[PDB]
A paper describes a structure:
SNARE (soluble N-ethylmaleimide-sensitive factor (NSF) attachment protein receptor) proteins drive membrane fusion at different cell compartments as their core domains zipper into a parallel four-helix bundle. After fusion, these bundles are disassembled by the AAA+ (ATPase associated with diverse cellular activities) protein Sec18/NSF and its adaptor Sec17/α-SNAP to make them available for subsequent rounds of membrane fusion. The disassembly requires multiple ATP hydrolysis events in the presence of Mg2+; as few as six ATP hydrolysis events are sufficient.
We chose the Sso1–Sec9–Snc1/Snc2 complex (referred to as the ySNARE complex) because each component of this complex crosslinked with high confidence to the D2 domain of Sec18 (Snc1 is highly homologous to Snc2). We prepared the y20S complex in a nonhydrolyzing condition and, after single-particle cryo-EM data collection and processing, we obtained 381,591 high-quality particles that yielded eight three-dimensional (3D) classes into which models were built. In the structures of all eight classes, Sso1 is threaded through the D1 pore of Sec18. A characteristic phenylalanine side-chain density in Sso1 is present at the same position relative to Sec18 in all classes, allowing for reliable indexing of Sso1. The nucleotide states and the arrangements of D1 around the substrate were also the same among all eight classes, with the ADP-engaged E protomer forming the top of a spiral staircase of tyrosine residues. Protomers D, B and C were all ATP bound and formed the middle of the staircase. The bottom protomer, A, formed the base of the staircase. Protomer F, with no apparent density for nucleotide in D1, was not associated with Sso1. Given that this charge distribution is replicated between each pair of D2 subdomains around the D2 surface, it is unsurprising that the Habc domain adopts multiple corresponding rotational states over the eight classes, presumably because of the flexible linker that follows it.
Residue numbers in the entry:
A (entry chain I): 2 to 15, 17 to 188, 197 to 227, 237 to 290
B (entry chain L): 433 to 499, 589 to 650
C (entry chain K): 213 to 257
D (entry chain J): 27 to 86
E (entry chain G): 1 to 108, 115 to 190, 197 to 292
F (entry chain H): 1 to 109, 114 to 292
């Protein structure tokens, strides 16, 4: 009942040779025993609320099950170690846990479950570690897998989380193209508006007018912006954004992009 | 004056009509949603029984390996209002039931994939015995 | 909109039918299999 | 004022029903996926049954 | 493709049980029946391809019979359901009924198929009594599964067919069960209950049903259905068939009377006219 | 990860049938084909992980071929379906068509119908081979009627009838709409599709200049379905028949605009209505 002792024995037991290999049953059975011992210690830790120790115990477990030749169970235990590490605020080892779980789920053909966790992984990269360049990759590969599964909704969700973040990273046109693909394969107002705003943030107003016009088959505020920009006036825009802030509070994304548009105006006034 | 009043008599009779059509459609929607809810009940139940049975099969396989016109406008509006309030109830109702069934389907489906995987595992192990 | 609430649920009725049939069929063959392994184990001993 | 209230109610119910159309579309997606996996589960169950019976006949 | 007739002939030849001295040396006949069933299943698939659906159903029936002889009753039930699919696709409702009966017996999913059997008995064969039985028993199995909705659809069908068949009291009782299961369609159940009670010339029980619905369900209290049932009760108590017809037309003008309600209402009118005639 | 090219080379080496004297000492070649198929499947999975989808599809086709040679037809059909998934997702519709055709041939030898409908979809949208798409939808709906999935049969037949009507086969489309009506009657659940079916049947008949059959279709619909009797569709069909009998194309255009304002005409209806208008205008020109 002492988890320390459970882990001691899990180390002592988890490859035999010599007389030991001959007398005692198969090696994978021993690795399974050590796996179970670490699982038991991990559950004791989880009950006692030492989450980090519980997740490290599940990591030891996971490695033991894959040394036994149990890939699926290993993936499950990696997800469990992630539950512990995530609930314990230890983001780094939680990211690690998912990378192993995904690694398995992916090589094992379980792409749908891969995607589910690929997305969760991207969420923690974006929100906590703030490594957006890799969160975009996760949000992209996960949506591509969802595309293979023909589960359009989740794929879309992934590509929106991708496009938004790419518009923040400054890949404005790539974002607008992801948004176009999100309009063709489909809330449809926001995609048009976001596309126009991104495109205006790239100082390309002609396409912006074009892409509203395509949206005749929010949109009015976009004209008001296309006009404020087309006449080098960062007080018309700054007033239209202020006015639109009443009937639809701007979210962080819009505020960022709109500040970039305002700057792209002022820099053009002083050129 | 009169032509318009005839026009709105027409508008409100047709309104009551297609509102009743919405009503009947919405109820038979809800009827089959209950039907399909209960169908997903048994889907869950057999998944549960198979989970237990796969536990048993796991242990057995392991051991094996070891071994007049105004008034009518008014009344038509009365009845349209009645139906419209009730249809609002029906729309909220359908949204709730779809939500519950959506979580249930997700759990059902994950369980089905898990059972499928376990069955391939047991079959492959049995092939080697 | 209600009319689509009627037709689409019909299109989904079928999926529910086939799912229920296939799942309980799988359950019976799992029962037969578990019995098969039980008699496997009795004579293996 | 009654007609406007009735209109507001109808617009709200239209909104709820559009939401429902989106939800039932997601549900139909999900049911198609479940039918595919239930066919897979059935086939695996027949296979497991036959394999176990063959293990019996091999042993006996 | 193999000839399905030859496959059936081989299935027949293999499906002969070992008799006499041979029984001492041959193993279990189960394997022979399994192989005959497999051959019959192949023949059935080939017939299904050719759209010769009745022949495919017959081949599935033979395969299910061999599966029963093999001890694989569950395969037999699955194959009976397949034979059913072939028959009800081919318009041979009788063999479809037989297949569902064997499948249901094995399963006792039964309910699901017992309901489909009731549907065939109602619509294709017009054997309403057995359809009533099928719906009642399916609904009971559903109620045992705490399946309120499936139980309810079965009891709605059972009550409707019973009421159309002159069994007004039993239909009213099944409507009572539907009401008790739905408390907390309900307005409609109250109406139908009273209507059966009016077709049995039991006006006072209809009045009690109306009062019950008014007290227990506010939505029914203020509903057109409650007012309509009250008006019908008033007409029945007054012995005025014309007033009843007027009420029926008004309710039709606002809420279309389906065929069932029309039929019940016509019988109620007929009863009223009969006491009028009997008093002359 | 193993090199998929090397896996395919090993699969090819193993998949050689035993010839000559060696055939007397070698067991069944089925096992060699199974192992070659396994190697092909591994290569296909590695390609799929690399997003080299067309190569994954090709590897799955090779695996399915070896599975067919092994006698494992069901696995071959599954592997053709996987090859298909890789091909559709890679934008190689032709090899996707081929994969579905092999998979359907295996499965047929309910699910076949499913894949036949998907094949029809590819033929319609990606390849624009409307004739074979019509064939796919017809045969799929026929199989669904043989499986009593009335609704799948109806979806296949609406696709088949729409494509036939757009292709000038108005009479056959009208016949399929008659079947759809007969399969939709008495169901509270198909009544809206029932109004649409009556309208499309009438429009197809009017495109065939048989205003008589349109009038009879309208009368049947008015008598058999009260919901259609009072519907905008029935009145519109009356109006179109009346314009056709009058030989007044302008009146038909006005009716089309009026119906459009209340109920948007989808593209199919616009095409068939334009055909009807042109038939009217041609009769006007020929009478003069």
């Amino acid at each position: 009942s002492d988890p320390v002792e459970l882990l001691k024995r899990a180390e002592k037991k988890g490859p035999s040779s010599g007389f030991m290999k001959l007398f005692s049953g198969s090696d994978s059975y021993k690795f399974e025993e050590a796996a179970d011992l670490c699982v038991q210690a991990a559950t004791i830790y989880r009950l006692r609320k030492e989450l980090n120790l519980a997740g490290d115990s599940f990591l030891k477990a996971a490695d033991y099950q894959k040394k036994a030749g149990n890939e699926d169970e290993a993936g499950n235990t990696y997800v469990e170690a992630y539950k512990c590490f995530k609930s314990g605020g230890n983001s780094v080892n939680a990211v690690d846990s998912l990378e192993n779980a995904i690694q398995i789920f992916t090589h094992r053909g379980q792409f749908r479950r891969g995607a589910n966790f690929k997305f969760e992984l991207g969420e923690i990269l974006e929100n906590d570690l703030h490594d957006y360049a890799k969160a975009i990759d996760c949000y992209e590969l996960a949506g591509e897998w969802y595309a293979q599964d023909q589960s359009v909704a989740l794929s879309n969700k992934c590509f929106i989380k991708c496009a938004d973040l790419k518009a923040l990273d400054g890949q404005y046109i790539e974002a607008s193209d992801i948004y176009s693909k999100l309009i063709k394969s489909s809330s449809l107002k926001d995609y048009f508006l976001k596309k126009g705003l991104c495109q205006l943030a790239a100082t390309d107003a002609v396409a912006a007018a074009r892409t509203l016009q395509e949206g005749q088959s929010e949109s009015n505020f976009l004209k008001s912006l296309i006009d404020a920009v087309n006449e080098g006036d960062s007080e018309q825009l700054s007033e239209h954004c202020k006015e639109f802030d009443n009937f639809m509070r701007l979210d962080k994304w819009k505020i960022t992009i709109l500040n970039k548009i305002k700057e792209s105006i002022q820099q053009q006034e002083d050129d | 004056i009169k032509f318009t009043k005839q026009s709105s008599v027409a508008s409100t009779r047709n309104t009551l009509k297609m509102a009743q059509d919405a009503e009947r459609a919405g109820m038979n929607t809800l009827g089959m949603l209950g039907h399909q809810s209960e169908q997903l009940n048994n889907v869950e139940g057999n998944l549960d029984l198979m989970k237990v049975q796969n536990k048993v099969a796991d242990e057995k396989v392991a051991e094996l390996k070891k071994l007049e016109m105004e008034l009518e406008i008014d009344r038509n509006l009365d009845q349209i209002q009645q139906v419209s309030n009730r249809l609002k109830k029906m729309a909220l109702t359908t949204g709730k039931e779809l939500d519950s069934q959506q979580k249930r389907l997700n759990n059902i489906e994950e369980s089905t994939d898990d059972l499928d995987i376990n069955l391939h595992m047991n079959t492959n192990r049995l092939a080697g015995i | 909109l209600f009319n689509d609430m009627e037709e689409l649920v019909i299109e989904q009725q079928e999926n529910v039918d086939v799912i229920d049939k296939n799942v309980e069929d799988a359950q019976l063959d799992v029962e037969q299999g578990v019995g098969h392994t039980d008699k496997a184990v009795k004579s293996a001993r | 004022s009654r007609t406007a209230e009735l209109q507001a109610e109808i617009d709200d119910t239209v909104g709820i029903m559009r939401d429902n159309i989106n939800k039932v579309a997601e549900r139909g997606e999900r049911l198609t996926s479940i039918e595919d996996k239930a066919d897979n589960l059935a086939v695996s169950a027949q296979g497991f049954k036959r394999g176990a019976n063959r293990v019996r006949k091999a042993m006996w």
